[PDB]
Design an enzyme around this catalytic site. Structure first.
Site, PDB file in Angstrom:
ATOM      1  N   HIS A   1      -4.937  -6.930  -6.522  1.00  0.00           N
ATOM      2  CA  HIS A   1      -5.190  -7.213  -7.836  1.00  0.00           C
ATOM      3  C   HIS A   1      -6.747  -6.601  -8.131  1.00  0.00           C
ATOM      4  CE1 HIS A   1      -6.296  -9.784 -11.528  1.00  0.00           C
ATOM      5  NE2 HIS A   1      -4.981 -10.313 -11.339  1.00  0.00           N
TER       6      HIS A   1
ATOM      7  N   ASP B   1       2.829 -12.325  -9.522  1.00  0.00           N
ATOM      8  CA  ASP B   1       4.327 -11.823  -9.766  1.00  0.00           C
ATOM      9  C   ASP B   1       4.979 -11.829  -8.286  1.00  0.00           C
ATOM     10  OD1 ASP B   1       4.078 -10.816 -12.305  1.00  0.00           O
ATOM     11  OD2 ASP B   1       2.377  -9.239 -11.296  1.00  0.00           O
TER      12      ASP B   1
HETATM   13  C1  LIG Z   1      -2.471  -4.867  -8.816  1.00  0.00           C
HETATM   14  C2  LIG Z   1      -3.002  -3.432  -8.742  1.00  0.00           C
HETATM   15  C3  LIG Z   1      -2.373  -2.623  -9.584  1.00  0.00           C
HETATM   16  C4  LIG Z   1      -4.535  -3.349  -8.601  1.00  0.00           C
HETATM   17  O1  LIG Z   1      -4.862  -1.788  -8.484  1.00  0.00           O
HETATM   18  P1  LIG Z   1      -6.178  -1.288  -8.204  1.00  0.00           P
HETATM   19  O2  LIG Z   1      -7.468  -2.568  -8.800  1.00  0.00           O
HETATM   20  O3  LIG Z   1      -6.746  -0.042  -8.820  1.00  0.00           O
HETATM   21  O4  LIG Z   1      -6.365  -1.493  -6.543  1.00  0.00           O
HETATM   22  P2  LIG Z   1      -7.092  -0.221  -5.620  1.00  0.00           P
HETATM   23  O5  LIG Z   1      -6.594   1.163  -6.236  1.00  0.00           O
HETATM   24  O6  LIG Z   1      -8.601  -0.419  -5.669  1.00  0.00           O
HETATM   25  O7  LIG Z   1      -6.602  -0.734  -4.170  1.00  0.00           O
HETATM   26  C5  LIG Z   1      -7.463  -0.793  -3.008  1.00  0.00           C
HETATM   27  C6  LIG Z   1      -6.629  -0.379  -1.596  1.00  0.00           C
HETATM   28  O8  LIG Z   1      -5.589  -1.105  -1.638  1.00  0.00           O
HETATM   29  C7  LIG Z   1      -4.286  -0.349  -1.738  1.00  0.00           C
HETATM   30  N1  LIG Z   1      -3.412  -1.025  -2.273  1.00  0.00           N
HETATM   31  C8  LIG Z   1      -3.615  -1.807  -3.489  1.00  0.00           C
HETATM   32  N2  LIG Z   1      -2.415  -2.653  -3.838  1.00  0.00           N
HETATM   33  C9  LIG Z   1      -1.625  -2.211  -2.570  1.00  0.00           C
HETATM   34  C10 LIG Z   1      -0.407  -2.839  -2.554  1.00  0.00           C
HETATM   35  N3  LIG Z   1       0.264  -3.648  -3.197  1.00  0.00           N
HETATM   36  N4  LIG Z   1       0.331  -2.353  -1.320  1.00  0.00           N
HETATM   37  C11 LIG Z   1      -0.180  -1.386  -0.649  1.00  0.00           C
HETATM   38  N5  LIG Z   1      -1.390  -0.934  -0.962  1.00  0.00           N
HETATM   39  C12 LIG Z   1      -2.111  -1.440  -2.144  1.00  0.00           C
HETATM   40  C13 LIG Z   1      -4.735   0.998  -2.655  1.00  0.00           C
HETATM   41  O9  LIG Z   1      -3.867   2.116  -2.108  1.00  0.00           O
HETATM   42  C14 LIG Z   1      -5.771   1.289  -1.794  1.00  0.00           C
HETATM   43  O10 LIG Z   1      -5.851   1.574  -0.369  1.00  0.00           O
HETATM   44  P3  LIG Z   1      -6.763   2.985   0.017  1.00  0.00           P
HETATM   45  O11 LIG Z   1      -8.539   2.743  -0.240  1.00  0.00           O
HETATM   46  O12 LIG Z   1      -6.452   3.418   1.431  1.00  0.00           O
HETATM   47  O13 LIG Z   1      -6.626   4.190  -1.037  1.00  0.00           O
HETATM   48  C15 LIG Z   1      -2.520  -2.880  -7.250  1.00  0.00           C
HETATM   49  O14 LIG Z   1      -2.917  -3.953  -6.308  1.00  0.00           O
HETATM   50  C16 LIG Z   1      -0.854  -2.727  -7.259  1.00  0.00           C
HETATM   51  O15 LIG Z   1      -0.419  -1.806  -7.553  1.00  0.00           O
HETATM   52  N6  LIG Z   1      -0.256  -3.777  -6.626  1.00  0.00           N
HETATM   53  C17 LIG Z   1       1.107  -3.624  -6.519  1.00  0.00           C
HETATM   54  C18 LIG Z   1       1.835  -3.937  -8.090  1.00  0.00           C
HETATM   55  C19 LIG Z   1       1.654  -5.437  -8.639  1.00  0.00           C
HETATM   56  O16 LIG Z   1       1.786  -6.313  -7.743  1.00  0.00           O
HETATM   57  N7  LIG Z   1       1.084  -5.390  -9.791  1.00  0.00           N
HETATM   58  C20 LIG Z   1       1.084  -6.781 -10.345  1.00  0.00           C
HETATM   59  C21 LIG Z   1      -0.428  -7.316 -10.693  1.00  0.00           C
HETATM   60  C22 LIG Z   1      -0.755  -8.534 -11.449  1.00  0.00           C
HETATM   61  C23 LIG Z   1       0.054  -8.295 -12.778  1.00  0.00           C
HETATM   62  O17 LIG Z   1      -0.505  -7.236 -13.374  1.00  0.00           O
HETATM   63  O18 LIG Z   1       1.052  -9.066 -13.156  1.00  0.00           O
HETATM   64  O1  LIG Z   2      -5.271  -9.658 -14.528  1.00  0.00           O
HETATM   65  C1  LIG Z   2      -4.957  -8.660 -14.255  1.00  0.00           C
HETATM   66  O2  LIG Z   2      -5.508  -7.508 -13.998  1.00  0.00           O
HETATM   67  C2  LIG Z   2      -3.088  -8.923 -14.004  1.00  0.00           C
HETATM   68  C3  LIG Z   2      -2.670  -9.956 -13.973  1.00  0.00           C
HETATM   69  O3  LIG Z   2      -2.828 -10.693 -12.900  1.00  0.00           O
HETATM   70  C4  LIG Z   2      -2.324 -10.534 -15.245  1.00  0.00           C
HETATM   71  O4  LIG Z   2      -2.521  -9.826 -16.327  1.00  0.00           O
HETATM   72  O5  LIG Z   2      -1.791 -11.702 -15.124  1.00  0.00           O
END
Ligand SMILES: CC(C)(COP(=O)(O)OP(=O)(O)OC[C@H]1O[C@@H](n2cnc3c(N)ncnc32)[C@H](O)[C@@H]1OP(=O)(O)O)[C@@H](O)C(=O)NCCC(=O)NCCCC(=O)O
Ligand SMILES: O=C([O-])CC(=O)C(=O)O
Ligand SMILES: CC(C)(COP(=O)(O)OP(=O)(O)OC[C@H]1O[C@@H](n2cnc3c(N)ncnc32)[C@H](O)[C@@H]1OP(=O)(O)O)[C@@H](O)C(=O)NCCC(=O)NCCCC(=O)O
Ligand SMILES: O=C([O-])CC(=O)C(=O)O
EC number: 2.3.3.16
Lengths: 426, 420, 145
Positions: free
Chosen positions: B297, B355
């Protein structure tokens, strides 16, 4: 070199990055870890949201470049297709690249016939921007493979499909509002000519493309193709940052462009000019604009970035004169009024102190109207041209190493924690 | 209280603002004028984009409040309509306000019949999110025109479930089912999605209660990507119905709401607990592209309070439906345990998010995977319009228009095609 | 104002619309057997040929209802070609009855069309006046009262 930020006794160094042109920027990506705070910038006007190689704007100098090329040079010399290739790929095309590019575009201008049914969901008095928004959004259903980022070539194809299909959807939207039969794209016509044909050809006689209008259209499209991080492009990048289908992202851009503070201003400008009607009525209008609690604005003036003349507005004014002259029109009342309104605004302290000048939307409606385009289609025409910039920006954003989701913070100023109260005790 | 920023051999003071809760922020609105630079923050993660009184999140502590009320208390006690009223208006409604509010919603659940034609523009195999995005965008055409803001908000909240259900029915080749005034928000959505023309539909109370909770859990989440898209498009003065289509587009992405559909596919592909090691290795294989969907997140760096409620609810519903075992849920729980004890995830503060467990519950309610993100969109429409309304009604609202760092070609002259 | 000799005030105060329809068409007030036969015939002709739905789609949603009524009733003539040239007296009665029975359905559907609301069918358990109100105002979300 670095910058120092000090807050609540603590200090931390932030990287200072410089671009090819434009202001240096302070990298705040580690600000919360270093100082436990966020910056606060509603409107985002002081935050650089991304790196970009597409377009450069020097707001104070009134300079606009696309991949390094000044807008005046492109508007004067280039075909719209050359500019589309340039914005999408980074360089102007050689003859072989150009022919391949234009062949690809003509190969994707036709829409899947089931799409006709979508137009029937609209009332005939529907605003074309709504038809464009909904129908482009619907188009995402036909390209499900695009719900995925994966392959480079597939992103190129999505971009080309959007650039090639938007004019057809826009023209069909227009025809639908007029109760006129849909006109198909013609491979023997270029991007500008084809749009005029799809918009104005009738079923009762062959359409004759007027070269005067084709050249004007070519210019108009180039002048609206891209403008860096404006609201609609920023909406496209924000939506696309989640990995969303690019077709849906363009619908998002269309939604944002429709607002009167953005692209919708071109429709608003002609309505404002028509209401003023005559130069003798300018004073009354300028007074309302200068009236602090009236909310009325001089549509077509002002910009988030330009604090000088918009190079596109200068070319737009010049084009109005050139087109009217070529069409054999000796006078255009509205153009005369707009020019006089510009002079009055530019010599009034309210506008001078605020650095408010004509923007791209001030003179565009006058040209479009002279081309026979109705007011209801001004913003849709902007959207057709801007789709090129939107997909170019989307492509750059999504292909950039290190791309992350766009997700800002806020300053919470609401109610503090409180326990739920049963309905009977409220 | 001020902060000092110095660059180039020049310093300038910036106001420091404090909220009701959360970190202090440095007001940089005059930074260019004062120091001639912009901040650089791709991803916007370190930039507070607006003031808001709607929702508060403390990501490090895993706290979520809506108008001050903890999400667990609302999910446990409130009807979804109460939560909609709360997010839109600022307070929980008394009986009179609540009855007036639900009356207004039921008064706008029916769609203009010409809308039926829109659905025919899609192939039957179209993804429901595409149908939802295009159709809601199209709806802006039917509403070209404060109390008008409230009415737009209510129309979107009342109509999105009907549009969502009709999209589902269309994909199934089933007759469209109309909203019923005698059913509440959660019940009506279940009826519109599952009623058949061959027999009267009987709403299963267990499912209605589950639906009520799921809608509440997805209603709003502060400045997420979709809400941010809605706010950005809306800042230009754009039609709110078109702004919601923009939000739907953003939510569809797999990094956002699309993650709920991606989670069930991931879990199904793993198949069994013995296949978790191979999957975790892919996730840790930096360059694989593979992520542990449903984890991570932008804000939470601790357990997502909605995920804990989602998991409890999975257990509660399965029990109430007489289901003794759900292999998929068992698998998810084991995956959570394994990831949470692995340094890769611990170091990055990656935890389950909303999710991770939602698809499991939704599947148990008979909702197809093709409709998971759409259900998210139906619930989130409440948050989107509440955020849009707050944004557009705020004194001093300005267009959202960021800057960039230009790193392209320097100025150069155009060369004609014949010379290229 | 007299209808077949009866003052308008007396008819408006005491008669059912159907009694007046029978009166104007036939010449006398109906006894009960005649009244039942007459109203049964009207209910048996209130439904429109479904192909007729397509005619409404030829209009913009902002079309004036009178234009919809004029054109659609004119179109209705296509469904009754034997009426093009009538010789038999029983056939004139049937044409008259079909027009009296169908015009309310066409009118209500025209209204619903302009409102973007689903078409509501005639109900045999409702009389002429009640049925017109139902067809014009019933919604798909709750039973109409
Ligand atoms: C949710 C999110 C998009 C957040 O993105 P963001 O704030 O830019 O995370 P980040 O880029 O700062 O990640 C930090 C580290 O964790 C890693 N990482 C983040 N999420 C990861 C995951 N789900 N699995 C594996 N690695 C992950 C990134 O690669 C990064 O690693 P490195 O520093 O080695 O490159 C990301 O965690 C992700 O893609 N999660 C999986 C998709 C998901 O579940 N989305 C739903 C989120 C809630 C919603 O919107 O409904
Ligand atoms: O808050 C966020 O960035 C993503 C999330 O969990 C939502 O929209 O419910
Ligand atoms: C273009 C823009 C939205 C830029 O917004 P923004 O960068 O937030 O301007 P701003 O809020 O910082 O305005 C600064 C001052 O100029 C004033 N101002 C801005 N534009 C004005 C206008 N067109 N007429 C009168 N006053 C205006 C603001 O009121 C403010 O005055 P005060 O400080 O006394 O309150 C705004 O100038 C505007 O609304 N212009 C008219 C609409 C228009 O032409 N839009 C098209 C722009 C180009 C495009 O997107 O196509
Ligand atoms: O750049 C902006 O903010 C708006 C603009 O002029 C455009 O998008 O053409």
């Amino acid at each position: 070199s670095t910058a120092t930020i000090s807050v609540d006794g603590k200090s931390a160094e932030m990287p200072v990055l410089s671009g090819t042109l434009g202001p240096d920027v302070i990298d705040i990506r580690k600000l919360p870890a270093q100082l436990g705070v966020f910056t606060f910038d509603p409107g985002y006007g002081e935050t650089a949201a991304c790196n970009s190689k597409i377009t450069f704007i020097d707001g104070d100098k009134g300079v606009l470049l696309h991949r390094g090329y000044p807008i005046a040079q492109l508007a004067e010399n280039a075909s719209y297709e050359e500019v589309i290739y340039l914005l999408l790929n980074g360089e102007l095309p050689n003859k072989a690249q150009y022919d391949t590019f234009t062949n690809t575009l003509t190969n994707h201008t036709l829409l899947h016939e089931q799409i006709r049914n979508f137009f029937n969901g609209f009332r005939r008095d529907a605003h074309p921007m709504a038809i464009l928004c909904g129908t482009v959004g619907a188009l995402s259903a036909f390209y499900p493979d695009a719900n995925d980022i994966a392959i480079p070539a597939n992103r190129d194809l999505a971009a080309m499909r959007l650039i090639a299909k938007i004019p057809t959807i826009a023209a069909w939207a227009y025809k639908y509002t007029q109760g006129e039969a849909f006109i198909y794209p013609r491979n023997d016509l270029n991007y500008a000519e084809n749009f005029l044909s799809m918009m104005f050809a009738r079923m009762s006689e062959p359409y004759k493309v007027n070269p005067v209008l084709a050249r004007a259209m070519n210019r108009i499209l180039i002048l609206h193709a891209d403008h860096e991080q404006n609201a609609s492009t920023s909406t496209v990048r924000l939506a696309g940052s989640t990995g969303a289908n690019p077709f849906a992202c363009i619908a998002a851009g269309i939604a944002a462009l429709w607002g009167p503070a953005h692209g919708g201003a071109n429709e608003a400008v002609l309505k404002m000019l028509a209401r003023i009607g005559k130069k003798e009525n300018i004073p009354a209008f300028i007074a309302q604009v200068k009236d602090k609690n009236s909310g009325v604005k001089l549509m077509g003036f002002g910009h988030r970035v330009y604090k000088n003349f918009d190079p596109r507005a200068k070319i737009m004014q010049q084009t109005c004169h050139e087109v009217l002259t070529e069409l054999g029109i000796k006078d255009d009342p509205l153009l005369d009024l707009a020019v006089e309104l510009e002079k009055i605004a530019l010599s009034d302290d309210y506008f001078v102190q605020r650095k408010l000048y004509p923007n791209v939307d001030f003179y565009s409606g006058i040209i479009l109207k002279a081309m026979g385009i109705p007011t209801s289609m001004f913003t849709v025409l902007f959207a057709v041209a801007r789709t090129t910039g939107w997909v170019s920006q989307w492509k750059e954003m999504i292909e950039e190493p290190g791309q992350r989701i766009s997700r800002p913070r806020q300053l919470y100023i609401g109610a503090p924690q409180r326990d739920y109260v049963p309905l009977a005790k409220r």
